[PDB]
């Protein structure tokens, strides 16, 4: 059965609630983004209205075969009426297609559901500027001060310079980048662009990227592995064994691999600056772990919430333990006393 923090009071609506069967009195199911924990349950057999972005709609149709009659895409930054209630979708700065949802309740209450998001000062100049929010349903993935990481721009700078240096020293090196879902596409796109190559991948991954409305995509990716010196592989294969095995298949074109594993936060963030990061190396294979986050740092989260000044906060991540829930409630009270709302 569907938990409370996925229901929107005073509406027939749920958010990211497809794994519970038929939800009593749900007339429209919202999906914030195409990540498996959130879409869990959708398929070609689903027969209720799904509301989402255009990009999420492309993935539902082509990857999950959801029938077209039940896909309701909405434009961003635009007031829309759904089942007699005003809603707006806003960019979440998460993965492609990810939204936040503003609901304007018939009784005068305003609710923001962040989905998964990476808070940014640019959100203080969206349609959120205009008015009050009474309840915030918040992506609390990294709600603790130990969670620090650099900007996406610094991480990409590090990856481009690392790849360009290595391939200029050795023109016979191959670059490999891990993936297991959408998001983080800038890692492999920026590397390929500096190297003057398309990105090679499987047919299944090429299909997924074709759903994402990335400009000039046909100029950036390919299924012809032989033509490309930046390859994508599933994340589970980014290890000394998997990469040895991959190099065998390239037909003596390459004598070295340099690989990247994007992660979220890891404990080596607690000591080592992005500049100072070093790889793990065995023979002619080197693997860099790089902390490319699509969720708010503690400081970014705190900034956003202090600016918005919500009356109540409902966390949507780390809700399963008493210690987690208690820790989060203490931070929300400090933020409120410090800023005076
Ligand atoms: Ni996500």
Structure in words:
Belongs to the DNA repair metallo-beta-lactamase (DRMBL) family. It is found in: Nucleus. This is DNA cross-link repair 1A protein. It is a single chain. With 341 residues, this protein is α/β, with parallel strands linked by helices. It is 26% helix and 22% strand. The two termini are 35 Å apart. The protein has a seven-stranded mixed beta sheet with strand order 13-12-14-11-15-17-16, sandwiched between helices. The chain folds into two domains: 193 residues, 4-Layer Sandwich (Metallo-beta-lactamase, Chain A); 148 residues, Rossmann fold (3-Layer(aba) Sandwich). Strand 4, helix 2 and strand 5 form a beta-alpha-beta unit. The protein binds nickel (II) ion.
Report the order of strands and helices: EEEHEHEEEEEEHEHEHEEHEEEHEH
| CATH topology annotation of the largest domain | Metallo-beta-lactamase, Chain A
Report on the biggest sheet: 7 strands, mixed
Distance between the termini: 35 Å
> Approximately what portion of the residues adopt beta-strand conformation?
15-25%
Please bin the fraction of helical residues.
25-40%
Report the total helices: 8
Give Rg in angstroms.
22 Å
Q: What is the approximate shape? A: globular
CATH homologous superfamily descriptor of the largest domain: Ribonuclease Z/Hydroxyacylglutathione hydrolase-like
The secondary-structure class comes to: alpha/beta
Lateral strand order in the biggest sheet: 13-12-14-11-15-17-16
Bound compounds? nickel (II) ion
**What's the β-strand tally?**
18
Please indicate the count of domains.
2
Query: Do you know the CATH architecture of the largest domain?
Result: 4-Layer Sandwich
CATH class of the largest domain: Alpha Beta
Assembly of the depicted chains: monomer
PDB class: hydrolase
Keywords: SGC - Diamond I04-1 fragment screening, PanDDA, XChemExplorer, hydrolase
Assembly: monomeric
Entry title: PanDDA analysis group deposition -- Crystal Structure of DCLRE1A after initial refinement with no ligand modelled (structure 4)
